[PDB]
């Protein structure tokens, strides 16, 4: 009587996820 | 990774990120090469009973189109395909680039 | 179970082998000819015939899922022995 | 605008055929035999045509069946004998037709089997 | 007289056995003459030869930068024209892996699109995760890119037990990635040079010519496919639509990334919102059914017999089915006469119509606004010639 | 009657006129195609093949045909004047590596079972 | 007013409503010359009456947008010159006449 | 092995010296390697 | 739902209008791009060392084709013919008849190399898993006939590769 | 019925089913019939002499708005004596719509290019011809697309043989690729998968 193991995400969720553009300012005047 | 930390400093001056909270290199956080095997649930018609086919049977439903306005053979308000598309909204996430 | 023409070819499971006057075997010249070495006919004919003491037997093969599919054998004639058609397995009831 | 053309239909010339295979060709005009190994009859409805069988040999290496006749795949399926013959006349193929064969409708009866002094009584069942 | 120029075959700016017969009055291009026909294959009467089941590997071989989008659109006409319909955990893989081929998709045009202008650099940083992108395709069908997974009645195979996390795994760091390509190209001034207002379309002109997809979206017109006519789960998913301002290489090159970004978001949706259950339609008249099953049962005997001979027969009827791949819309036209083999199949390639405007595209422009204009265009000859 | 529409030609009188103007393009064009392509053929060679291949439908009767034949020929001499064509093309139509097929009855009857 | 239509090649319109107008009483000058009876006269006369009440009784533009559902007035104005266009040429065609020829018998019988 | 470089550097062979009868000092080829080892390189596997 | 990528005005302010004459004229972003491949240039490459070093494959890799057999040392094939049939490239050609101890085998079993698409539909077919795609990659010959595999080749395949492919299939068979 | 089958949608068949009706009054010259098919796709069968009318009034009416061409192709059906069929599909962005137009026509008469009513159609009705040999009038550059140069013949025909009839080869005698009738080592094998009893007795002819 074994239960069904399948591939899913873990309970809860997965981590988020980054998308927005990341271009930081870096420099002087 | 492996590597100096001066060279790492460096690297994080160059590009402007921390380059070592995110490497493209995997290096052991990903998933093994062998598993456990797996179950696999079964379908929704693997019932031993009510389960004739015929009350499941999606490719006998189709039926020939339905003919409008054969040739051979009031206001009457206008129509059109389908009603207006609604107008789109601007991205309460990020609307600008 | 391999053997050699009177040409020195070796003789394929399936029998074929280039005759005298067949000028294709100019192809093996300064080459080889590919003859698989284990005969199927043979290994299966060493396998002993399992005893059963039932009329009608079950085979899949071996391994489950990782057989062949299931069949039923019956086993009522004594002159004989029931031969599975996907294996070549053999099966018979205990005799005389 | 009509300017009433009186000739016979003929396309042979904008097909792109190759002479020899509109000339020697003989195509057949059919509707095909039922398999005899099964009972069903849907593979008798429409009208075949197909073309004369050409020679196929031994390939020297491998021993495969070799070719050269380009239309010896070539199946075409007509819903009427008419318009399998038309085809064939504007594409300038000699044909032969056969005329579609059905079977007879036969009187079957079940009682027939246990005649009084009949013939047609079963000797088993 | 004007020069006339053959650029390719044999040309690295071509991106395929494109022969495009150029008209230059010094580099000026007078004319473009797109001459195609260089990978014509007859993919359609071979299809017309095959049962639906063996018509499906060429629709892996129309576009080879976005195969499981261009199986996904067939497996929806013919699932539409069987009247089945595939299970939710099905659907959901196949948005995810579409959108996994989006990536690959936009990776491949950004980068070979920055190649031909100069900047040969990106493209080695972001083949890395094609490359990786590649053992997501392979560990779920045994292929880098032909995978044939996506099938008519669902998906061929269930995920293996711990591929979900890798796929978290690359998608959490993918957009540091984009970053890096932004900041080699996005405020770059020779790349800007190089792409703003050269072919500039106008909307109504986008309209008229058939184009779609980046094409449509750069001269701001509103539509994706997705949000408009949506199949498979993208009526679940939330992601906004890039839309341009000026409908030139710049603003194509723009949109392209952010839905590079996008995609993203819509693959972290997918892997949070996978659900359990079977991966083809429970109809063994239609899919074929299990190997423990077809070697204990009968009828599951006789049913992978007859779909593996003769294969399922598709009511009679035509459909034209449409979907949104990364290359703009991609098409379907399907007729089936009753039979298991279909009877005429149509493919639409935006390719073919953006190609075909390539010469509009290119008025008052030099030659290496040409080749720039070929690489906004996104141009993979698999599909244009079929 | 036979109701039928036309292509270009309402009789073969505007059919015969289409094909001669084609016929004078394509004679025109030999000299500059045996130069052009380097081919090893002479001027005569091309007019004769081109005059060859013009009588290859002199039979039809159609002035339908007829528009079609000459809407083809035309795209081909499209075709060869713009060198979108290569020598191989301009070649083929001479079969030049094509051994001779035999007509009579008994060496077809030799060489094996087709007519 | 407004910069920016938003779509390449559309210039934003300065005075829509008097365009509006100037080209909807076109249209039905137009329709006028059709005859009463075919569907295309009174179909296209009901929707531009319609369109035209909504122009003059509204004299503002992003309220007469959401009223005319036409997306973006620029794009209204360019509609209503199609159909313009479109009538002018259905007054050359006159598509409300019998229909010209009737197909074989077997001509759109599918499958086969 | 070294579990400690990238995925793809991790495991590695140092072919043979002499095959069947071919000298491989200079000479190898991914082909040389058996079906296990094989399956285990190209991590198929995580067992030996 | 939609945004905008190249919708932005620029600053008009006197700060701003500086810093965008120090970009044009000392090229800053110019240096942006130089510092991204300078720091590139430190990172480690991605590049393995083939062919001591292979890439990752998985159980259900398509490679090589292979003719199986039972424990027993019999062939797995009974000539039903279904992978012929369902060979999209029809890259399959089958001979058989009753060998001479009545057994349903095949006496011609070739795959043309050249013609397959490697699509693993036949595996996927063989009701007996006698035919597999094997987990092989590396087999370029010098000559097109090398290509071109019978029964004594494909045999030969099963026998030099049965020890991972028995061990592929039992990864992966719970999937199928 | 609900698992494993394809859900319906009433709402966009009867809107398809009105808007049908819509043309078909608007344009009784030309349309022969309308259709809407199960999975509601709407379908208008025309008379071949109104192709430009039915669709410039497709794309330019105010209720219609079919402003972009999705693709356009052909069909060839031997049996009947109009062999070829010609599929126009349309979308509407303004009403979110798909429409599709068909007409007929046979290998010796010419059909109207729509080239005007759509820039798209160039490059579609050039395939066309290649492929079927159907003949465009008024098409602005009207020659081969898809085939090689100097091929002989319409590759799409039901007719033609899926190997053609010459295959090319480099010969070195002559220095050059040449064309020559078609040898096949291994011939395409003709498969009958046609079963012989009825799949669908919804489609069932009457026996005639
Ligand atoms: C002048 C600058 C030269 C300095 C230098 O070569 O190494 C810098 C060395 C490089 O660090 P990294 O490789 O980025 O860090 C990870 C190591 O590679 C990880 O270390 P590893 O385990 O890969 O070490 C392998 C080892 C052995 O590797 C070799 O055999 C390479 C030798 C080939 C060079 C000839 O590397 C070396 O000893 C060769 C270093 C220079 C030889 C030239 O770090 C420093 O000592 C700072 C150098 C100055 C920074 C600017
Ligand atoms: S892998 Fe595909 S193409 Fe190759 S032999 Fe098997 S079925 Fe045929
Ligand atoms: S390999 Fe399998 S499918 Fe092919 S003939 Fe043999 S048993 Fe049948
Ligand atoms: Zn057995």
């Known amino acids: 009587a074994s239960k069904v193991k399948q591939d899913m995400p873990p309970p809860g969720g997965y981590g988020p996820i980054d998308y927005k553009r990341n271009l930081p300012r870096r420099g002087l005047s | 990774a492996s590597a100096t930390r001066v060279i790492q400093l460096l690297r994080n001056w160059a590009s402007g990120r921390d380059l070592q909270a995110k490497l493209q290199l995997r290096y052991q956080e990903i998933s093994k090469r062998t598993q456990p095997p797996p179950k696999l649930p079964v379908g929704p018609s693997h019932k031993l009973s009510n389960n004739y086919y015929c009350t499941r049977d999606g490719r006998r439903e189709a039926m020939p189109p339905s003919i409008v306005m054969s040739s051979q053979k009031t206001e009457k308000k206008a129509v059109t395909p389908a009603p207006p598309i609604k107008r789109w909204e601007l991205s309460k996430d990020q609307p600008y680039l | 179970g391999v053997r050699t023409s009177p040409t020195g070819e070796k003789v394929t499971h399936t029998g074929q082998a280039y005759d005298d006057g067949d000028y294709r075997r100019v192809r093996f010249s300064d080459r080889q000819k590919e003859v698989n070495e284990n005969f199927a006919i043979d290994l299966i004919a060493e396998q002993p015939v399992s005893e059963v003491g039932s009329r009608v037997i079950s085979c899949d093969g071996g391994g489950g899922a990782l057989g062949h599919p299931r069949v039923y054998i019956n086993l009522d004639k004594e002159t004989k022995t029931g031969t599975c058609g996907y294996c070549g397995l053999q099966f018979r009831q205990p005799h005389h | 605008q009509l300017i009433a053309v009186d000739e016979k239909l003929d396309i042979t010339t904008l097909t792109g055929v190759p002479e020899e295979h509109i000339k020697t060709r003989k195509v057949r005009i059919f509707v095909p035999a039922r398999n005899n190994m099964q009972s069903g009859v849907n593979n008798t409805k429409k009208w075949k045509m197909e073309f004369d069988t050409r020679e196929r040999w031994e390939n020297p290496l491998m021993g495969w069946s070799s070719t050269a006749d380009p239309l010896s795949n070539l199946v075409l399926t007509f819903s009427t004998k008419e318009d399998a013959v038309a085809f064939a006349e504007k594409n300038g193929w000699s044909f032969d037709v056969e005329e579609r064969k059905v079977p007879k409708p036969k009187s079957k009866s079940y009682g027939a089997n246990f005649s009084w002094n009949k013939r047609t009584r079963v000797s088993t069942k | ?386 | 009657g036979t109701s039928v529409k036309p292509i270009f030609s309402r009789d073969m009188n505007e059919a015969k006129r289409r094909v001669r103007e084609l016929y004078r393009a394509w004679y025109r064009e030999v000299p500059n195609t045996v130069h052009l392509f380097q081919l090893d053929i002479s001027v005569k060679q091309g007019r004769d093949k081109v005059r060859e291949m013009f009588m290859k439908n002199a039979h039809v009767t159609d002035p339908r045909v007829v528009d079609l034949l000459v809407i083809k020929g035309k795209m081909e001499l499209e075709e060869t004047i713009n060198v979108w064509k290569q020598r191989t093309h301009i070649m083929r139509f001479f079969h030049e590596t094509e051994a001779p097929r035999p007509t009579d009855f008994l060496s077809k009857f030799y060489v094996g079972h087709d007519p | 007013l407004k910069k920016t239509t938003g779509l390449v090649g559309l210039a934003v319109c300065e005075t829509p409503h008097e365009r509006l107008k100037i080209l909807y009483t076109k249209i039905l000058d137009v329709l006028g010359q059709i005859p009463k009876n075919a569907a295309y006269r009174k179909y296209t006369e009901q929707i531009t009456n319609e369109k035209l009440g909504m122009v003059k009784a509204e004299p503002d533009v992003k309220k007469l947008e959401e009223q005319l559902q036409g997306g973006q007035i620029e794009e209204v104005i360019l509609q209503a010159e199609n159909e313009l266009s479109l009538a002018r040429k259905m007054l050359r065609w006159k598509p409300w006449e019998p229909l010209v020829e009737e197909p074989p018998a077997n001509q759109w019988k599918w499958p086969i | 092995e070294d579990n400690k470089q990238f995925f793809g550097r991790h495991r590695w062979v140092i072919y043979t010296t002499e095959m069947n009868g071919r000298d491989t000092f200079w000479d190898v080829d991914g082909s040389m390697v058996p079906p296990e080892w094989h399956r285990w390189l190209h991590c198929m596997t995580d067992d030996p | 739902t939609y945004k905008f990528v190249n919708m932005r005005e620029p600053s008009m302010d006197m700060k701003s209008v500086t810093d965008r004459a120090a970009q044009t004229l000392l090229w800053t972003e110019l240096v942006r791009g130089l510092g991204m491949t300078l720091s590139y240039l430190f990172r480690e490459p991605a590049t393995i060392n083939y062919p001591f070093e292979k890439g990752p494959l998985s159980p259900r890799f398509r490679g090589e084709h292979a003719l199986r057999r039972y424990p027993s040392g019999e062939e797995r094939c009974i000539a039903c013919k279904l992978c012929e049939a369902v060979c999209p490239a029809q890259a399959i050609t089958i001979e058989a008849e009753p060998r001479a101890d009545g057994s349903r085998r095949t006496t011609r079993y070739d795959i043309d190399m050249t013609k397959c698409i490697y699509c693993g539909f036949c595996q996927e077919a063989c009701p007996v898993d006698a035919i597999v795609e094997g987990p092989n990659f590396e087999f370029s010959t010098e000559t097109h006939e090398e290509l071109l595999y019978n029964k004594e080749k494909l045999l030969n395949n099963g026998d030099k590769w049965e020890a991972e492919i028995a061990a592929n299939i039992q990864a992966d068979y719970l999937y199928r | 019925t609900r698992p494993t089958i394809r859900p319906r949608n009433d709402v966009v068949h009867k809107q398809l089913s009105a808007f049908g009706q819509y043309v078909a009054e608007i344009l009784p010259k030309y349309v022969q019939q309308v259709q809407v098919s199960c999975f509601n796709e709407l379908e208008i069968f025309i008379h071949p002499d109104g192709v430009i009318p039915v669709l410039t009034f497709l794309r330019d009416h105010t209720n219609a708005q079919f402003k972009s061409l999705a693709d356009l192709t052909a069909v060839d059906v031997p049996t009947r004596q109009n062999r070829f069929e010609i599929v126009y599909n349309l979308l509407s962005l303004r009403f979110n719509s798909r429409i599709r137009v068909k007409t007929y026509t046979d290998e010796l008469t010419p059909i109207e290019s729509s080239v005007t009513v759509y820039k798209a159609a160039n490059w579609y009705e050039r395939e066309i011809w290649d492929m079927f040999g159907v003949f465009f009038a008024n098409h602005p550059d009207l020659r081969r697309i898809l085939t090689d140069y100097g091929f002989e013949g319409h590759p799409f025909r039901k007719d033609f043989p899926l190997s053609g009839y010459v295959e090319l080869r480099y010969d070195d005698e002559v220095k050059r690729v040449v064309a020559e009738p078609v040898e096949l080592a291994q011939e395409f094998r003709k498969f009958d998968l046609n079963s012989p009893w009825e799949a669908f007795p919804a489609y069932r002819q009457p026996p005639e």
């Open chain 5, 1 to 386: 007289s004007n020069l006339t120029l053959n650029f390719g075959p044999q040309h690295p700016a071509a991106h395929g056995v494109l022969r495009l017969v150029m008209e230059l009055s010094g580099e000026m291009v007078r004319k473009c003459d797109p001459h195609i026909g260089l990978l014509h294959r007859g993919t359609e009467k071979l299809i017309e030869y095959k049962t639906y089941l063996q018509a499906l590997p060429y629709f892996d071989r129309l576009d080879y930068v976005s195969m499981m989008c261009n199986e996904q659109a067939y497996s929806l006409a013919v699932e539409k024209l069987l009247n089945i319909q595939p299970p939710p955990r099905a659907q959901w893989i196949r948005v995810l892996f579409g959108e996994i081929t989006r990536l690959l998709n936009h990776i491949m045009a950004v980068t070979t699109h920055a190649l031909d202008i100069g900047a040969m650099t990106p493209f080695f940083w972001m083949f890395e995760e094609r490359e990786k992108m590649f053992e997501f395709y392979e560990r779920v069908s045994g292929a880098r890119m032909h995978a044939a997974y996506i099938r008519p009645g669902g998906v061929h195979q269930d995920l293996p037990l711990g591929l979900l996390d890798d796929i978290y795994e690359f998608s959490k760091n993918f957009s540091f990635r984009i970053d890096e390509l932004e900041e080699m190209l996005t405020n770059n001034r020779i790349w800007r040079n190089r792409t703003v207002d050269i072919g500039v379309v106008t909307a109504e002109d986008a309209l008229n010519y058939g184009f779609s997809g980046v094409m449509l979206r750069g001269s701001g017109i509103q539509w994706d496919l997705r949000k408009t006519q949506p199949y498979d789960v993208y009526d679940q998913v939330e992601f906004d639509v890039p839309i341009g301002s000026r409908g030139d290489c710049y603003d194509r090159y723009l949109c392209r990334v952010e839905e590079m970004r996008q995609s993203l978001r819509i693959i972290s949706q997918c892997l949070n919102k996978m659900p359990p259950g079977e991966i083809k339609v429970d109809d063994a008249k239609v899919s074929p059914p299990k190997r423990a099953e077809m070697k204990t049962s009968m009828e599951s005997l006789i049913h992978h017999f007859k779909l593996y001979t003769e294969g399922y027969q598709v009511p009679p009827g035509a459909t034209y089915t449409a979907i949104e791949a990364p290359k703009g819309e991609f098409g379907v036209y399907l007729v089936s006469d009753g039979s298991s083999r279909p009877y005429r199949c149509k493919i639409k390639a935006p390719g073919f119509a953006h190609l075909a405007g390539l010469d509009k595209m290119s008025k008052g422009h030099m030659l290496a606004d040409v080749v720039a204009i070929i690489g906004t265009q996104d141009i993979v000859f698999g599909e244009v010639d079929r």
